[PDB]
Paper text:
The ATP-binding cassette (ABC) transporter, MsbA, plays a pivotal role in lipopolysaccharide (LPS) biogenesis by facilitating the transport of the LPS precursor lipooligosaccharide (LOS) from the cytoplasmic to the periplasmic leaflet of the inner membrane. MsbA forms a homodimer and exhibits a topology similar to other ABC transporters, comprising two NBDs and two transmembrane domains (TMDs) containing 12 transmembrane helices. Upon binding ATP, MsbA undergoes dimerization of the NBDs, inducing rearrangement in the TMDs. An ATP hydrolysis-driven conformational change promotes the transition to an outward-facing (OF) conformation, facilitating the flipping of LOS to the periplasmic side of the inner membrane for further modifications.
The fifth MsbA structure adopts an open, outward-facing conformation and was resolved to a resolution of 2.7 Å. First, well-resolved density is observed for KDL binding, even for the six lipid tails. The positioning of KDL is centered on TM5, occupying a specific region within the cytoplasmic leaflet of the inner membrane. The coordination of KDL is reminiscent of our recent structure with R188 and R238 interacting with the characteristic phosphoglucosamine (P-GlcN) moieties of LOS. While the structure is in an open, outward conformation, the transporter is not bound to nucleotide. The π–π interaction of Y351 of the A-loop with the adenosine moiety (observed in nucleotide bound structures) is substituted by a cation–π interaction with R354, priming the NBDs for binding ATP. Moreover, tube-like density is observed in the transmembrane region, in which we modeled the C10E5 detergent. The nucleotide-free open, outward facing conformation presented here suggests nucleotide is released post ATP hydrolysis prior to repopulating an IF conformation.
Residue numbers in the entry:
A (entry chain A), B (entry chain B): 7 to 579
The structure:
C-alpha cells in the first residue's frame, strides 16, 4: 500500500469525528484573521515609532490589545482541543477494534503468538496513529495551501523565472518519497522492537523464580540490554533519517534562490524583468522555504502513523475463527457422538486423535481414562470446537458441531476444572458471568448455596458483592472450583465437561466440592476426564485412550474382567 | 519532591551523556551565528531591492547561499542527533535500571502486583523521561537566556517602564507553578491508566477460553471500552491543561504591553522618555512574548517526564529482597534441619506452617505427603528462601539460612518439577543456564545423555544448538522435565527439591524420566513432594503434613503399622 492507499483506509475511522477537524479549521482561520488585524495595527508602531500615532487611538489601544489576546487565546484553545479530540477518538477506536479482533481469533492463534507482541500492538502501535489523524492532516493542508498559493504568485509575477520550480519540484518529490518509505520501514522496525521489549520483560517476570534459583541475573541483564539498545538504535535511525532529509530538501529548495541570484547578475536578464519583479520572486521563494520545512517535519510523524495503520489494517484483515454454521441449538437434549474423528494439532505431524468412535449418551456419565498426552484433553477441546477436526464428524443432537453457531454451541457446554479464571468483578457477577441481566440475586444466592460456596462467600467483606479477580482478592483452588460449580448450576448447561483435580485438598473443602459435584452437578450429560478410582467406579461408561486411540471401553466390572489396560491402571491405583 | 528536587536526581543519569548536550549547544551557537550572517547579507536585498547591489557581489551570491545552506544543514543534523542521542541513552538507562530492580524484588512482591503494571512502567513510563532529558533542557536554557537578556535590555533602556515586569513576573511564575503541578498530576494519572489498559488486555488473553465458553465478548468489550475511554479522557485533560495555561500566560504578558501603551498616551510620560525609548521597550516586550510561549509549551513535556521520573525513583528506592547474610557456602555436605519453624504468608491471617521440626539427613531422601495446601510447597519455598520464616530457624550445614548469601545458598539447591520454564536460547544454553562459560559442550552432552535426553535432542534441527523457549520451539512436559534433570545433573547440586508430577505420561517418556530421576538424580540429599505410592515406598523417611503441622513421621511399614494418617492415605491410593 502507498501512503495514499493506507490513508483512504484510515479515513472511515476519522469521518465520525470530522466535526472536530472542521471546528479546528474554522478556529485556525479566525486566528489567522485576528493575527492579520494585529499585524496591520502593529506595523506602524514598530516601524514609524511612537509619536506619529494619534493620541486618541493610543487611549483605546490597550483595550484592543487585551481583546485581541483574549480572542487569540479562545481560538487557540478551540483548535488545540478539537485536534487532540479527533486524535484521541481515533486512537481509542483503533484500540477497541484491535481488542475485539484479538477476542475473535481462534485458540490456535494464541499458541503461535507471544502476549507481549499483542500487548504492544494495543498499547504502542495504536498510539502512533494519533499523529496522522488530526494534527498532521491539518498541518499538511495548511502548508500545501501556502506552497500552492506561493507557486501561483510566482508564475503570476514572472513565469520565466519560475521554470526553476518545474525543474526542482520533481527532485523534492522524489526525495520526499524516498524518505517516506524509509520512515515507514523504520517505524515498523520500532514497533517490532517495542514488542520484543515487552516480550523480554514478560519472560523475565514469568521465569523469575528460575532466575533466582539458577542465578543468571547477569545473563538476563545482558539479554535485556540487547533489546533496550536495539530500541535505542531504532529510534536513532528515525532521528537520523529525519535530520538528513530536512536539510537536503532545504538545499534543493535554495537551489532556486541560487538560480534567481545567478540570473539577476546578467544585465540583459535584469532590465527585461524591470528589476522589481525579481525582488518579489526572491522574497516569494524565501517565504516558500518555511512551509516546505514544516511539511517535511510533519512528514515523519505522518509516516509513523501510516506505518502503524498499515500494520493495524493487516491485523484487522486476519482470519477469525470460522462461524459458518447457521443452526441455533437451544438445549442439547441428545447424545454427543464421535464418528471416526481424526484430529491433528496445527503444526504437529503425528495426529493427537485417530479414528475416535465415542458416544456420550444423554444424561449419562462417560469417564475418559488415559495417560497425559493420550488425547482426552483433545477430546474436551474438540467438543467445544476450540479446534476443528481434520476428519470425521462430532454430532450434537444428531447434527454436526460445524452446523451450529459457535455461541449457541458453547451455550450447551459447561467446563468445570480445578483451574478457574476469575474475572475482575464481584462474586455474584462472576457466578452470573455474561448473564447478569438474566439471573436475579435470589437465583445467584440459590446457586451459590447449592454449590456449598455460600459459607466462604458470607465470610468475606461484602459477601456476594466482594470484588474478586486475578489481581486483588483471590481464592484458593477449592473456592474458585466451587464458584465454577455455582456458575454451572446457575447456567444449567445440558453438557458438562469435568476436568478432575489431580490433588486432594483439605477434608472440609474436599467434602464440600465432592458433595456439590455429586448431588448437584452430575445429573446431566457428563464427560469427566477423571483421575481418582472412586469416580471411575461411579461412571456409567469408561473409555480408555492410549496414544490417540481408544483401546478399551465398558464398565468397571467389565473392564476388570477383560484384564485390559484399565485392569493394570486400576491395579496401580 | 519539587520540580527541582526530582531534576537533581535525574541529572546523575544524564551526566554520562553530557557530551551530546555540549555538542548540541555548540552546534546551535554555530547555527545562530550562520543565521545572523545570512540575515545581515539578506536584509539589503529584500528591503532595498535588486539593482542597488554590486554586480560582482551578485556573481558570488549563489555560492554563498549554497555554502550557508550546507552549513545550516550540518549544524542542524549535529544538534538534532546529539539531543536525540542523549534522550535515547537516558531512556535506555532508565529501562535497564527498572528491569534490574524488578529482577531483584522478593517473590512476595509479585503476588500483590499485576504484570501489566510493571510492563507499562518499563515500556511507557520510562519513555516519558526522554523529553526532560535533552530537548526540554536545551529549550529551557535558550528561552530563559533570551528572556533574561530582554529583561536586562528593558531595564537598561527604561527602568521606570520596566517596573511592570517586576509586577507581572510573580503572576506568571505562580501560574506556571500551578499548571506544572496540574501537569504532573495528569501525567501520573495517565501512567496509571496505561497500566490499567495493559492489564485489561492481558487478563482477556488469559481468560480467552473462559470468554469463549461463557460468552461475554460483549461484557469484555464494555470493560475494555471503559479503560480505553479513561485513557482518552486523561490525555484530553492534559491537552486542556496546556491549552488553558498558554493563552493565560500570554494574556498576562500582554498586560505589560497594555500598560506601556497606556503610559505612552500621556504627553508628560512621553516627552520625558524622548519618545524613542518607548518604541524600543515596546518592541522588546513584543519580542519577549515568543520565548515565553516556547517556555510554556516545553513545560508540559518537562512536567510529563518529571512525573515519570518521580514515579521511577520511588520504584527504584523500593526494598529488594534482604541479603544481609555474609557467609558463602561452597557445597552443602550436611543436613537441612527445621527447628520450630513457623511461617505465615504475607497478608494471610492463619499460619501456613506451625512448629515444623523436620530434618533432611545428608544423602538421604524424605518424602513429604499431604493434601494440597497442607504446607509441603511452603517447605520447599522456605528451603530456597523465597520467603523468610517468622519464627524458628532452618539450618544448612549447622548455620541458619539467613546467614548465607542468597547466591551461594541458592547454588546448593536444585528444583526439579514437571513445569519447567524454558529460557529463549539454545538447548545447550538452557542445560548450562547461567553457567555456559563454566561447562563445556562435552560436559553438556554427557549430562543430556545421562538424563536420557539425547534422543529427542538429536531428533531436532540443530540438536543442542536448536533455539528453544517459551515463545517458539517448545517441548512437551516430559521433554522439559528431562532437560531440567540434565541441568541439575550438570550443576551437581548437593540438595534436590523434587516436585513430583501428578499425572503419568506415555510409556517411553515415563520410563526415561523414571530412569533418569532414580539412577542419576536421586543419589543426594533429596526432598520429594511425592504423589505416587511407589516413590513413598522407596523413601528413607516419610513426613505427613496436615494444616501446616506434621501429624505423623516414620517409614512406610512403620506408618502402616501406626494406623495413622498415612494408613488411610495409602488406603485410597
Ligand atoms: C462551530 C461552532 C461549534 C459547533 C458545535 C460544536 C461542533 C462539534 C465540536 C467538535 C469538538 C468536540 C469536542 C467535545 O465534544 O467536547 C465536549 C465539550 C462539549 C461542548 C462541545 C460543543 C460546544 C458548543 C458551543 C459551546 C460554547 C457556546 C466534552 C468534552 O470532550 O470534555 C468533557 C470535559 N469537559 C471539559 O473539559 C470542559 C472544557 C472542554 C470543552 C471543549 C471546548 C472546545 C471544543 C468545543 C468546540 C467549541 C466551539 C466554540 O471546556 C473548558 O474548560 C473551557 C475553558 C475555556 C478556556 C479558554 C482559553 C483561554 C481563554 C483566553 C485567555 C486569554 C469534562 O471535564 C471535566 C473537568 O475536567 C477537569 O477537572 P478535574 O479536576 O480533572 O475533575 C477540568 N479542570 C481543569 O482545571 C482544567 C485544567 O486543569 C485547567 C488548568 C489551567 C491552569 C491555569 C492556571 C492559571 C493561574 C491563574 C494566574 C495566576 C474541568 O474544566 C474546568 O474546570 C473548566 C473551567 O471552569 C474553565 C475556567 C474558566 C475559563 C478560564 C479562562 C479564563 C481566562 C480569561 C480571562 C479574561 C472539567 O470540567 O470531562 C468529560 C469526561 O469526564 C466524565 C464526565 O464527567 O463527563 C467523567 C468520567 O468519570 C471518571 C472516569 O470514568 O474516568 C470517573 C469519575 O469518578 C472521575 O474520576 C472522573 C474524573 O477523572 C474526575 O476528575 O473520571 C467518565 O464518566 C467520562 C465518560 O466516560 C466520558 O464518555 O465522563 C469530557 O466529556 P467526554 O468527551 O464525553 O469524555
Ligand atoms: C565537538 C566536536 C566533536 C567532538 C567529538 C564528539 C563529542 C561526542 C559526541 C556526542 C554525541 C555522540 C553521538 C555518537 O556517539 O554517535 C556515534 C557517531 C560516531 C561519531 C561521533 C564522534 C564524531 C567525531 C568527529 C567526526 C567528524 C570529523 C555512533 C552512533 O551513534 O551511530 C551509529 C550509527 N552511525 C550512523 O548512523 C552514522 C551517522 C551518525 C553519526 C552521528 C553524527 C552526529 C553526532 C556526532 C557529533 C558530530 C561532531 C561534529 O552519521 C551520518 O550519517 C552522517 C550523515 C551526514 C548528514 C549531513 C546532514 C545534511 C548535510 C547538509 C545538507 C545540505 C550506525 O548506523 C548504521 C547505518 O544506519 C543506517 O543504515 P541501515 O540501512 O539502517 O543499515 C544509515 N543509513 C541511512 O540511510 C540513514 C538514513 O536512512 C538517511 C535517509 C535520508 C534520505 C535522504 C534522501 C535524499 C534523496 C536525494 C534527493 C533526490 C547509515 O548511515 C549512512 O549511510 C550515512 C550516509 O553514508 C551519509 C551520506 C552522505 C551524507 C549525505 C548528505 C550529503 C548532502 C550534501 C550535499 C552537498 C548508517 O551507517 O549504527 C550504529 C549502531 O548499529 C550497530 C553497528 O553496526 O555499529 C549494529 C547493531 O546490529 C544490529 C542490532 O543488534 O540491532 C544487528 C545487525 O544484524 C543489523 O540488523 C543492525 C541494523 O539493524 C542493520 O540495519 O542492527 C548493533 O551491533 C549495534 C550495537 O548494539 C550498538 O551498541 O551497533 C550506531 O552506533 P551506536 O551508537 O554504538 O548504537
Ligand atoms: C491560515 C490557517 C488556515 C487553516 C485551515 C485549516 C483547514 C482544515 C481542514 C481539516 O483537515 C481535513 C483534511 O482531511 C481531509 C481528508 O480527506 C480525505 C478524503 O478521502 C476520502 C477517500 O475515500 C475514503 C473512503 O474510504
Ligand atoms: C523548490 C520547489 C519546492 C516545491 C515543493 C513541492 C513539494 C511536493 C512534495 C509532494 O510529494 C509527494 C510525493 O508523492 C508523489 C506525487 O505523485 C506523483 C504522481 O505522478 C505524477 C506524474 O507526473 C510526472 C511529471 O514529471
Ligand atoms: C542561540 C542558541 C544557543 C544555544 C545554547 C545551548 C546551550 C546548551 C546547554 C546544554 O544544556 C544543559 C543544561 O543542563 C544543565 C543542568 O545542570 C544541572 C546541574 O545540577 C546538578 C545538581 O546536582 C545534581 C547531583 O545529583
Ligand atoms: C511579562 C513578564 C514575563 C516574565 C516571564 C518570567 C518567567 C519565569 C517563570 C519561572 O517560573 C518558575 C516557578 O518557580 C518558582 C521560582 O522560585 C521562586 C523562589 O522564591 C523566590 C522568592 O522571591 C519572592 C520575591 O517576590
Amino acid at each position: 500500500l502507498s501512503t495514499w492507499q493506507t490513508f483512504r483506509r484510515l479515513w472511515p475511522t476519522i469521518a465520525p469525528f470530522k466535526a472536530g477537524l472542521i471546528v479546528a479549521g474554522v478556529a485556525l482561520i479566525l486566528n489567522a484573521a485576528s493575527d492579520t488585524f494585529m499585524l496591520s495595527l502593529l506595523k506602524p508602531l514598530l516601524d514609524d515609532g511612537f509619536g506619529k500615532t494619534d493620541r486618541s487611538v493610543l487611549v483605546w489601544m490597550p483595550l484592543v490589545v487585551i481583546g485581541l489576546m483574549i480572542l487569540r487565546g479562545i481560538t487557540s484553545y478551540v483548535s488545540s482541543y478539537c485536534i487532540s479530540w479527533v486524535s484521541g477518538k481515533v486512537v481509542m477506536t483503533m484500540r477497541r477494534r484491535l481488542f475485539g479482533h484479538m477476542m475473535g481469533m481462534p485458540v490456535s492463534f494464541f499458541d503461535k503468538q507471544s502476549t507481549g507482541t499483542l500487548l504492544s500492538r494495543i498499547t504502542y502501535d495504536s498510539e502512533q496513529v494519533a499523529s496522522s489523524s488530526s494534527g498532521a492532516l491539518i498541518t499538511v493542508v495548511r502548508e500545501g495551501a501556502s506552497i500552492i498559493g506561493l507557486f501561483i504568485m510566482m508564475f503570476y509575477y514572472s513565469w520565466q523565472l519560475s521554470i526553476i520550480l518545474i525543474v526542482l519540484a520533481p527532485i523534492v518529490s522524489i526525495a520526499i518519497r524516498v524518505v517516506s518509505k524509509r520512515f515507514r520501514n523504520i517505524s515498523k522496525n520500532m514497533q517490532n522492537t517495542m514488542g520484543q521489549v515487552t516480550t523480554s520483560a514478560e519472560q523475565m517476570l514469568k521465569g523469575h523464580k528460575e532466575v533466582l534459583i539458577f542465578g543468571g541475573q547477569e545473563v538476563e541483564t545482558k539479554r535485556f540490554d540487547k533489546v533496550s539498545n536495539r530500541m535505542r538504535l531504532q529510534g536513532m535511525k528515525m532521528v537520523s533519517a529525519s535530520s538528513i532529509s530536512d536539510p537536503i530538501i532545504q538545499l534543493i529548495a535554495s537551489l532556486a534562490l541560487a538560480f534567481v541570484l545567478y540570473a539577476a547578475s546578467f544585465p540583459s536578464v535584469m532590465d527585461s524583468l524591470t528589476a522589481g519583479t525579481i525582488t518579489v520572486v526572491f522574497s516569494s521563494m524565501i517565504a516558500l522555504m518555511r512551509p516546505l520545512k514544516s511539511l517535511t517535519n510533519v512528514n515523519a510523524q505522518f509516516q509513523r502513523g501510516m506505518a502503524a495503520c498499515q500494520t493495524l489494517f493487516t491485523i484487522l484483515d486476519s482470519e477469525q475463527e470460522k462461524d459458518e454454521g447457521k443452526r441455533v441449538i437451544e438445549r442439547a437434549t441428545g447424545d454427543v457422538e464421535f464418528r471416526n474423528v481424526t484430529f491433528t494439532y496445527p503444526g504437529r505431524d503425528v495426529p493427537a486423535l485417530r479414528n475416535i468412535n465415542l458416544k456420550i449418551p444423554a444424561g449419562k456419565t462417560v469417564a475418559l481414562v488415559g495417560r497425559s498426552g493420550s488425547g482426552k484433553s483433545t477430546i474436551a477441546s474438540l467438543i467445544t470446537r476450540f479446534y476443528d477436526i481434520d476428519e470425521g464428524e462430532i454430532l450434537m443432537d444428531g447434527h454436526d458441531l460445524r452446523e451450529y453457531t459457535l455461541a449457541s454451541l458453547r451455550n450447551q457446554v459447561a467446563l468445570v476444572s480445578q483451574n478457574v479464571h476469575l474475572f475482575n468483578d464481584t462474586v455474584a457477577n462472576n457466578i452470573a458471568y455474561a448473564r447478569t441481566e438474566q439471573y436475579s440475586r435470589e437465583q445467584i444466592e440459590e446457586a451459590a448455596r447449592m454449590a456449598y460456596a455460600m459459607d466462604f462467600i458470607n465470610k468475606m467483606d461484602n459477601g456476594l458483592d466482594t470484588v474478586i479477580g486475578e489481581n486483588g482478592v483471590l481464592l484458593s483452588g477449592g473456592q474458585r472450583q466451587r464458584i465454577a460449580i455455582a456458575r454451572a448450576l446457575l447456567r444449567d448447561s445440558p453438557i458438562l465437561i469435568l476436568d478432575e483435580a489431580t490433588s486432594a485438598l483439605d477434608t472440609e473443602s474436599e467434602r464440600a466440592i465432592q458433595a456439590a459435584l455429586d448431588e448437584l452437578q452430575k445429573n446431566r450429560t457428563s464427560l469427566v476426564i477423571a483421575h481418582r478410582l472412586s469416580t471411575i467406579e461411579k461412571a456409567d461408561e469408561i473409555v480408555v485412550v492410549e496414544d490417540g486411540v481408544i483401546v478399551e471401553r465398558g464398565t468397571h466390572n467389565d473392564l476388570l474382567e477383560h484384564r485390559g489396560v484399565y485392569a493394570q491402571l486400576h491395579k496401580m491405583q
